Amino acid sequence: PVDVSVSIFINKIYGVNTLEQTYKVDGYIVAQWTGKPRKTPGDKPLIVENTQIERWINNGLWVPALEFINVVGSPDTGNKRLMLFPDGRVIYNARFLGSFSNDMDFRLFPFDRQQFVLELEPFSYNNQQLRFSDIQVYTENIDNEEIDEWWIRGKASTHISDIRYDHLSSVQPNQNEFSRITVRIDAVRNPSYYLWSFILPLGLIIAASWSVFWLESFSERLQTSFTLMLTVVAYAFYTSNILPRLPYTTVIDQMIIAGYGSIFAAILLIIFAHHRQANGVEDDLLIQRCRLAFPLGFLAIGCVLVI
Amino acid sequence: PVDVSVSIFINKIYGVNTLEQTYKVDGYIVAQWTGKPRKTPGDKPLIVENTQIERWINNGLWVPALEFINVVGSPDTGNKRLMLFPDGRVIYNARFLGSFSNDMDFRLFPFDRQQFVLELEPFSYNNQQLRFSDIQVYTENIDNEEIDEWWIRGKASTHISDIRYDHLSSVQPNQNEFSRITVRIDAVRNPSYYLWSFILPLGLIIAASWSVFWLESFSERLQTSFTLMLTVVAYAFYTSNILPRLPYTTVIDQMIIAGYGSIFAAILLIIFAHHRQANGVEDDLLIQRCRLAFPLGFLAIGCVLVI
Amino acid sequence: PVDVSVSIFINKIYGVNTLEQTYKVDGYIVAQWTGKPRKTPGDKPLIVENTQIERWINNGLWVPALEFINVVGSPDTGNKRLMLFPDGRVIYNARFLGSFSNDMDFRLFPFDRQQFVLELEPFSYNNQQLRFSDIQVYTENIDNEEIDEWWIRGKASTHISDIRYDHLSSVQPNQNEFSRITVRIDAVRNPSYYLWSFILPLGLIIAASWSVFWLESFSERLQTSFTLMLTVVAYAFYTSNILPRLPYTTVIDQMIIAGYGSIFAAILLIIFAHHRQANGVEDDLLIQRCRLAFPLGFLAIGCVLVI
Amino acid sequence: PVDVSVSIFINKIYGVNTLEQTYKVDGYIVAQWTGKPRKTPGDKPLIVENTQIERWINNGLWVPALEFINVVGSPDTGNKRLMLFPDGRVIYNARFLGSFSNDMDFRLFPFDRQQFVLELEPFSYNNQQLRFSDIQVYTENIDNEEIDEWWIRGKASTHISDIRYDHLSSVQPNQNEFSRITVRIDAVRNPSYYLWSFILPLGLIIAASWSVFWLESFSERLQTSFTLMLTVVAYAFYTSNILPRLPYTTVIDQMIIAGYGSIFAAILLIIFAHHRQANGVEDDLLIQRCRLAFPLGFLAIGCVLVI
Amino acid sequence: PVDVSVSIFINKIYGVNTLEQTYKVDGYIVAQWTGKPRKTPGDKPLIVENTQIERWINNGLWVPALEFINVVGSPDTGNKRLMLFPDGRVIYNARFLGSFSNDMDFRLFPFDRQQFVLELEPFSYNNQQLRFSDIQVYTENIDNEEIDEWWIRGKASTHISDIRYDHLSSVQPNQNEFSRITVRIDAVRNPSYYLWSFILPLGLIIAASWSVFWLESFSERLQTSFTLMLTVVAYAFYTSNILPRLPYTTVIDQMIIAGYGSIFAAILLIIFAHHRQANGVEDDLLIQRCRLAFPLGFLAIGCVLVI
Ligand SMILES: CN1CCN(C(=O)O[C@@H]2c3nccnc3C(=O)N2c2ccc(Cl)cn2)CC1
Ligand SMILES: CN1CCN(C(=O)O[C@@H]2c3nccnc3C(=O)N2c2ccc(Cl)cn2)CC1
Ligand SMILES: CN1CCN(C(=O)O[C@@H]2c3nccnc3C(=O)N2c2ccc(Cl)cn2)CC1
Ligand SMILES: CN1CCN(C(=O)O[C@@H]2c3nccnc3C(=O)N2c2ccc(Cl)cn2)CC1
Ligand SMILES: CN1CCN(C(=O)O[C@@H]2c3nccnc3C(=O)N2c2ccc(Cl)cn2)CC1
């Protein structure tokens, strides 16, 4: 059972696709194992780049194909390198840019916590043939957190395991466990942009909605919530067109639903204030003055949606 | 007639193109058929990965090309593996990402039922040369329905059948039936996002539209439905910029039309109210008070569109 | 002069690009021609799939390149197959997906009739070297038009001709006419979406524009016409974002220009009615009541557009 | 010094990318030169299609690589052809699709004059080794300009010149001038769509803005200018979503700023009119009756854009 | 320790992706080194183009792969050229187009200062095997600055350095410093388009907002502030849709925030003016006439955000 020791060097994690639950990783794989000793020129290690690697594989060099289990599509492999040592050991070094897949929950956007994952697994060789000895992951990142969209928490957490593959086994009974390296990088979204540019003005819109009650006439009170309604639509349009695509409501979506709610609720009280009377124009002196009543009724219903 | 056994492993079904009637399928194919026995190194099955498979083919390994009938474009093939057993049998295993085509009706969106389909068929060998012995499909999915756009329902239908290509047959008469594997995976759309952020406020807009009759003045009444019209336009827009491209009207698309209708029907009633008179300002006390007439008249005419 | 029988089987015609004048065709080419008899294994027809065709060609197999004349870029090719019969004859079968070029008039959108074309031609052999014996095209489609964007009308037109490249001929004089196959598929656009979701409400906006004249005051008449204008801009905006980009105006675009007009004409009359007076508010006592005059005056200006 | 004759046949010029200063050119390249006499099968010219050309190159056939100096990326090449004549001469024919770069000024859009340029040059051979003997360009386009976005004007300009790369020469001193073919194709934009759907309504918006002065009251005069303001924004938007992305203002863009200006200037005058007084309500019966004054001040700013 | 002399020729720097922090570079690499003397045809340096380069490599030509350290994905390579001299020296020449990554701060857009960076380093060989003797960069760009998006300021930066990978060294101890060429080009953004088309009209929007205090009534003062609010939303939208996407606010983003605030402060002062009284309509003679107060109060807070 060949021991393969791995090092992944992560260069940039970028381009998160909310819809596809996808993110881009550029970096390097280094894979090392020990073969039977060789005679290299001089005595110095033999270097074999790109094209020539296939030539060595033809003359019988075992260079096992390691699949990125959760890569969507197949990665752009940059340069490849075989490092063949005379003491026997073999190093395969190559650059890759890949699009990777992971479960991503975006429901509390723009306050999501996500985690970026890599899954390596030898493509054709079982655990009894090729085994992952160890893995080091190097996230050569740090600093400039507010210039980048995401805050990396940890240093990269790792777990090597055995996967079975209990569908038709049968082919090779007793031996259908593959060893799998699983690298996880934890991360937090830097919400500033979304707070100041989406959350804040959506609030000023929402708040200023409640100023509909400081209007004197019923005609004023009502004709204005129609403009005010048109505003939340202008906003939802502005919001939706800019924000990441998801198949669900995020927190910001709910804020917008709440805007439609306060305003539609406003419409109802306002019409109600007017026509519920003991004459015709008996506008409920206190209900018309719910100018404080439901702004804080919104903030109570607001603090409960937080739970 | 070579018996070929297939097993398809479905990893991710994503990216439905509504206009193109398209979806993405990531997975693995395993194909097995049995040959004349080989003398393999050691005695354990021989592994041939990617490039070396072509090398084996140039030397006469029969690897029959299995075509994805309904793949739009030609799939992204990942690692390929030939697994050659001494008892003769041959296993072809490769990872694939493909764009598949199937008839998709999205009329009752966002509540569509869809079925993601795969059709396998040997590219050059007929039922009398190469035959599909059996096929199993494994969708090793589970959990997180409320996170995903699509909810898979069954375990996946399978069907092997025989296709008669009766166009110039003639070339090889009597032997022009190809055997076809058909996988069908049932699905339902996640209607939550479309309900809460589209259906709901669209209703509040349509509903608030009716509050125009609670206005005292005629000029207020009329000038108002023009802001109100401007609303359903800004809203139809927000919908169409965000919702999926189609060549037909969905349930939402209709709501928008009924939206335009209520307002335009209103405008007419309002002018009628005013100008159908025996003086100038004889507003039909009852017709100006059709505040209940067409709000509940909209629910009957609205629900008849459901039949 | 080698006789080539061609047969194209059309699977999907999708993805029309209105600015670039483009469409996608997925299907298969089958080309048949006859060589000197071969000694094939058994005596049965010899099959050569993908990778191997190029190999036979290094050993002198003439497999002439047939070019897609009006293809944009170079086609996505699926599986290749040579079918080599012992009596001499040779059949080439391949799958393709290509983006094709053709003149397309979209002036009468959403009611265009279009025709999707394939133009095949030998890439290197003239009419005296390679000639198209015949060509048949099978678009084994039918049914479900109300699901697809386009409705195919005919069964496909065919045309074999001779193309005379008379630019420097000279090199090989008297012999530079290549034989060309031309396929034609007629189609009609499915106007349903555009009828209900563009034409109808745009008609309602314009119609409701005319309701400006039932407004009592001048202040009312002119201000409401500003909202009216903004609704046509909001509509102008919703139209252009969803509708296909063209370098010319369609029918829907004109309805829009007509909209801005009916509204701008009213602005002018409305100011006129009021300021053309013998006192100050002498709205030409009758002209303000052109409530019927220019709506049907619009429909006549509308039918002058039948020309 | 090898004499090479070139002929380019342009099939389609399309897809102008304003931002990147790029356009697509599809066509064929033909190059002819005279080698040492050969013995071809029969004695008529030998044809070598695609794959097979490298094979001929591997055996010492000089097929010199001619680079498209201004191509963005590397061209999509379709079928390749070698034509080997017994008298020595060699013909290289290939189809290409390329994105080419040239300086493009889009300021006076939608009436720009652009020129599509192709630049050809041997990649590895200097003027003393390989020289462009002559070149002719064929624009086999014609008819129906009214359906196409761009109108090709001339019959294509041609220039063979010598480029002196005087950077370290040194390597090969006295000999580092490359021969360069320059093709120029002038064209004009189809101004129809933009005149009718941008300029005409952009104008009617700006014009109707001026009706603010026929409003009687000060509220009306001031408040409407705000609604009037929102319209130039909504119009600014539609303009921006549809029109080409540039790093500078176009004519229309300036038209839009002028819309914003006329309205902001009106805001001031309207306020000035009201408050420049000898009472409170000394509304300049005249400055409020600059109803003719500043529409022609706009026609003046309009004619100043020409100076 | 092989001396490699490098020269980069920059053709075009374009296509900057703000979210990915990406930009496109088209140009040429020249690499020169001296090997052991060769026997070339004639005595003139031998030319080996594209395809034939690998053929020389398979015969043992050392052609070391130079990695673009900071490239995103792997470059589109055009023509390659090997120039093999009799005296030993070898020149590698290739055109390339790549997307490169560099840290980009876009906080004070549109008044950005950026620097476009290229990083070269041998993929497999350290400082002791392969060393960069010198490098010159030629950016033969100039002029028409007001036509191109970015104004290249300095000439070109050059820095050869030694990178110490101190990760498992071990494998090759004492020798794991690679020599790195770093090219820096400074550039400044052309702020014209965003000034004249964004900054300016945004300013006129904000300013014309303050005129709400010149309105006589409270309803005039309040209701208009809502149309004023919807106008900022409209502008936010138009801005957002056109401007480059980033994860943080730029200057324009703040202007919009300031716009939202100014309107909300107005909603407040205005309601307050009205209800802070000793009667009911005692509109504070100074606070109603904060017509100068907070137009200038915005200018100090506007001037303090700059400092
Ligand atoms: C990464 N590597 C290991 C797994 N492979 C694989 O084994 O494929 C399928 C697979 N994919 C998903 C889930 N289960 C299975 C399974 O049981 N397979 C299988 C089963 C038998 C044989 Cl001979 C080959 N493959 C592809 C290459
Ligand atoms: C998957 N497969 C079966 C179909 N092949 C082929 O049959 O293509 C066509 C095809 N496509 C669609 C409908 N009918 C036909 C037909 O009659 N064909 C055909 C073409 C050539 C020959 Cl020799 C025999 N048959 C190619 C490979
Ligand atoms: C199908 N086809 C590809 C184009 N080929 C070719 O003929 O190239 C050009 C071409 N393209 C478009 C229009 N006319 C011509 C012409 O007259 N050509 C030409 C010019 C010289 C020689 Cl030797 C051969 N052909 C020939 C066969
Ligand atoms: C078509 N083409 C191929 C590449 N060639 C080349 O000359 O590239 C560079 C280049 N590109 C742009 C501007 N100047 C130069 C220069 O002086 N070069 C150069 C550098 C070294 C050597 Cl040996 C030869 N040429 C020139 C002709
Ligand atoms: C340009 N070139 C040199 C080095 N390569 C390389 O060094 O890969 C990794 C790498 N990438 C990023 C950061 N550090 C390292 C490291 O220490 N590696 C490594 C791992 C094993 C061996 Cl033998 C040599 N080097 C990449 C290609």
Q: At what angle do helices A293-304 and A251-275 cross, to 10 degrees?
A: 150
Which residue is listed with tokens 């030319």? E47
Q: Residue E210 carries which DSSP code? A: G
E66 pairs with which residues across the strands? E122
The residues spanned by each domain of chain E are: 1-190, 191-307
C13 pairs with which residues across the strands? C25
Token pair belonging to D118: 């192709």
For ligand 2, whether the C-beta of C47 sits within 6 Å is no
For ligand 1, whether the C-beta of A168 sits within 6 Å is yes
- Best residue among E119, E123, E167 to mutate for probing ligand 5, ranked by most atoms within 8 Å of CB: E167
Half-sphere exposure of C172 (CA within 13 A, CB side): 23
Q: Which runs of consecutive H residues, i.e. helices, occur in C138-242?
A: 192-194, 200-209, 218-242
Q: At what angle do helices B218-242 and B251-275 cross, to 10 degrees?
A: 170
Phi, psi of C132, deg, nearest 5 = -85, 110
Query: CA dihedral defined by A130, A135, A140, A143, rounded to 10 degrees?
Result: 140
Asked if residues B120 and B7 have their Cβ atoms less than 8 Å apart, the reply is no
Token pair belonging to A135: 């893995």
Give me the amino acid identity at B93.
Answer: N
Task: State the first-to-last Cα distance of chain B, in angstroms, to the nearest integer.
Answer: 52
Order of all β-strands in the sheet with B2-17: B46-49, B76-84, B89-101, B22-34, B2-17, B130-138
**What distance in Å separates the CA atoms of residue D71 and residue E12, rounded to the nearest whole number?**
11
Phi, psi of A198, deg, nearest 5 = -125, -55
Phi, psi of A288, deg, nearest 5 = -65, -25
CB contact under 8 A, A201 and E236: yes
**What distance in Å separates the CA atoms of residue C248 and residue C255, rounded to the nearest whole number?**
14
**For residue C27, which of C68, C82, C63, C84 has the smallest C-alpha distance?**
C68
**For residue C140, which of C6, C13, C23 has the smallest C-alpha distance?**
C13
Q: Which residue puts its alpha carbon closest to atom 1 of ligand 3?
A: C123
Nearest to C249 among D52, D76, D193 (CB): D193
Query: CA dihedral defined by A217, A222, A227, A229, rounded to 10 degrees?
Result: 150
Q: Alpha-carbon torsion C130, C136, C140, C144, what sign?
A: positive
**What distance in Å separates the CA atoms of residue D205 and residue C259, rounded to the nearest whole number?**
12
The total number of residues written for chain C in this structure = 307
CB contact under 8 A, A214 and E103: no
Phi, psi of D136, deg, nearest 5 = -120, 140
Report the residue of A51, A58, A67, A72 to disrupt the B interface, i.e. the one with the largest count of B CBs within 10 Å.
Answer: A72
Q: Residue E73 carries which DSSP code? A: S
**For residue B136, which of B27, B2, B9 has the smallest C-alpha distance?**
B9
**What distance in Å separates the CA atoms of residue A290 and residue A297, rounded to the nearest whole number?**
10
Token pair belonging to B243: 């919702």
Which residue is listed with tokens 């003062």? E221
Collapsing DSSP to helix, strand or coil, E67 comes out as strand
C182 pairs with which residues across the strands? C119, C159
Asked if residues A202 and A235 have their Cβ atoms less than 8 Å apart, the reply is yes
- Strand A76-84 vs strand A46-49: parallel, antiparallel, or unpaired? antiparallel
Q: Residue E71 carries which DSSP code? A: B
Q: How far is CA D238 from CA B212, C46, D243, in A?
A: 30, 62, 8
Residue of B nearest to C46 (CA): B124
Q: Which residue puts its alpha carbon closest to atom 8 of ligand 4?
A: E28
> Angle at Cα E15 formed by Cα E14 and Cα E17, nearest 5°?
135
Phi, psi of A26, deg, nearest 5 = -110, 140
Give me the amino acid identity at B270.
Answer: I
Residue of A nearest to E254 (CA): A197
CB contact under 8 A, B12 and A101: yes
For ligand 1, whether the C-beta of B26 sits within 6 Å is no
Write out chain C residues lying below 8 Å of B229, CB-based.
Answer: 205, 208, 231
Task: State the first-to-last Cα distance of chain E, in angstroms, to the nearest integer.
Answer: 54
Q: At what angle do helices C200-209 and C251-275 cross, to 10 degrees?
A: 10
Q: Which runs of consecutive H residues, i.e. helices, occur in chain D?
A: 52-58, 192-194, 200-209, 218-242, 251-275, 293-304
Residues 6+ away with beta carbon under 8 Å from E44: none
Asked if residues A113 and A187 have their Cβ atoms less than 8 Å apart, the reply is yes
How many beta carbons lie within 10 A of that of residue D141, not counting itself? Answer: 16
**For residue D49, which of E80, C37, C60, C29 has the smallest C-alpha distance?**
C60
Residues touching ligand 3 (Cβ under 6 Å) are C 67, 121, 123, 165, 167-168, 171, 178; D 7, 9, 28, 30, 91, 93, 140
Residues touching ligand 4 (Cβ under 6 Å) are D 67, 121, 123, 165, 167, 171, 178; E 9, 28, 30, 83, 91, 93
**What distance in Å separates the CA atoms of residue E299 and residue E307, rounded to the nearest whole number?**
12
Which residue is listed with tokens 């483009």? C22
Residues 6+ away with beta carbon under 8 Å from A198: A110, A239, A242, A243, A252
The CA A125 to ligand 5 mean position distance, Å, reads 26
Token pair belonging to E42: 């004639």
Phi, psi of D222, deg, nearest 5 = -80, -50
Collapsing DSSP to helix, strand or coil, A163 comes out as strand
Token pair belonging to E43: 């005595």
Residue of D nearest to E92 (CA): D124
Write out chain E residues lying below 8 Å of A234, CB-based.
Answer: 230, 233-234, 237
Nearest-atom index, ligand 1, CA of B140:
13
Phi, psi of A103, deg, nearest 5 = -60, 125
Nearest to B147 among A103, A227, A232 (CB): A103
- Residue D258, Cβ density class (10 Å: 0-12 exposed, 13-18 middle, ≥19 buried): middle
Secondary structure (H, E, C), B38-49 = CCCCCCCCEEEE
**For residue E242, which of D247, A91, B78 has the smallest C-alpha distance?**
D247
**What distance in Å separates the CA atoms of residue E133 and residue D23, rounded to the nearest whole number?**
40
A185 pairs with which residues across the strands? A116
User: Is CATH 2.70.170.10 the classification given to domain C1-190?
Assistant: yes
Q: Alpha-carbon torsion C37, C42, C47, C53, what sign?
A: negative
**What distance in Å separates the CA atoms of residue A112 and residue A189, rounded to the nearest whole number?**
6
CB contact under 8 A, B192 and A64: no
Q: DSSP string covering A227-293, please?
A: HHHHHHHHHHHHHHHHSPP-SS--HHHHHHHHHHHHHHHHHHHHHHHHHS-SSS----TTTTT-TTH
Write out chain E residues lying below 8 Å of D236, CB-based.
Answer: 201, 238
Give me the amino acid identity at B288.
Answer: Q
**For residue B56, which of B65, B48, B66, B46 has the smallest C-alpha distance?**
B48
E12 pairs with which residues across the strands? E26
Token pair belonging to B6: 């297939």
Please provide the CATH number assigned to the domain covering B191-307: 1.20.58.390
Q: Which runs of consecutive H residues, i.e. helices, occur in chain B?
A: 51-58, 192-194, 200-209, 218-242, 251-275, 293-304
> Looking at the CA of D141, which ligand is closest?
3
- Residue B228, Cβ density class (10 Å: 0-12 exposed, 13-18 middle, ≥19 buried): buried
> Looking at CA atoms only, how far is residue D234 from chain C in angstroms?
7
Q: DSSP string covering D24-59, please?
A: EEEEEEEEEEE-S----SSSSPEEEETTHHHHHHHT
Phi, psi of E203, deg, nearest 5 = -65, -45
Phi, psi of E76, deg, nearest 5 = -75, 110
Token pair belonging to E26: 């088209």
Nearest-atom index, ligand 4, CA of D172:
23
Asked if residues A95 and A79 have their Cβ atoms less than 8 Å apart, the reply is yes
Query: CA dihedral defined by C139, C141, C145, C148, rounded to 10 degrees?
Result: -70
For ligand 1, whether the C-beta of A121 sits within 6 Å is yes
> Looking at CA atoms only, how far is residue A165 from chain E in angstroms?
33
Q: Which residue puts its alpha carbon closest to atom 4 of ligand 4?
A: D123
Method: X-ray
